[PDB]
Curated annotation (Swiss-Prot), chains A, B:
Oligomer status and interactors: Isoform 3 interacts (via BRCT domain) with the nuclear DNA-repair protein XRCC1. Interacts with POLG. Interacts with POLB.
Gene it is expressed from: LIG3
Chain ranges of the BRCT domain: 5-81
This protein's name: DNA ligase 3
Classification of source organism: Eukaryota, Metazoa, Chordata, Craniata, Vertebrata
Tissue: Testis, thymus, prostate and heart.
Disease: Mitochondrial DNA depletion syndrome 20, MNGIE type: An autosomal recessive mitochondrial disorder characterized by severe gut dysmotility, muscle weakness and atrophy, neurological abnormalities including epilepsy, migraine, stroke-like episodes, learning difficulties or cognitive decline, and neurogenic bladder. Brain imaging usually shows diffuse leukoencephalopathy and may show cerebellar atrophy. Disease onset can range from infancy to the teenage years.
Organism in which the protein naturally occurs: Homo sapiens
Physiological role: Isoform 3 functions as a heterodimer with DNA-repair protein XRCC1 in the nucleus and can correct defective DNA strand-break repair and sister chromatid exchange following treatment with ionizing radiation and alkylating agents. Isoform 1 is targeted to mitochondria, where it functions as a DNA ligase in mitochondrial base-excision DNA repair.
Length: 81, 81
């Protein structure tokens, strides 16, 4: 009687995930699972969110791996951190 | 009180998913969510499972999108189809 449907938490969140990110594999897995849009390096200027510096994409919202997990815990987007 | 953990159904299943696969986006999302290993085109000879012909990888197990969904329904790998 458990759900067979993944929640859509990160719908519309376009994020480049640097391979150097600690815990990259699990972050990628969970972000994709919950409807996040991973962009490749060549497309990082189209991201809406960034890990680390905003210098290459000033309009992007700065977030962190900790934010990704927090959103997953809450089952929705939380205020960026 | 709902789980925060994705099930590991496709652990060790290495699969190249052709972009032409009907329902590609959702298949990719769900396969990744449940611990599947997507390989890129240049690495398809290392796959353990294949959609379509085995001519380029005779040892691979032939499966289908329908198999992927069936595994998800059962919460475990089912006999290939």
């Amino acid at each position: 009687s458990q759900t067979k449907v993944l929640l859509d938490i990160f719908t519309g969140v376009r994020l480049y995930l640097p391979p150097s990110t600690p815990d990259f594999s699990r972050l990628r897995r969970y972000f994709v699972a919950f409807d996040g849009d991973l962009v490749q390096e060549f497309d990082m200027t189209s991201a809406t969110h960034v890990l680390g510096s905003r210098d290459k994409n000033p309009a992007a919202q700065q977030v962190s791996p900790e934010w990704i997990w927090a959103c997953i815990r809450k089952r929705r987007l939380v205020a960026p951190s």
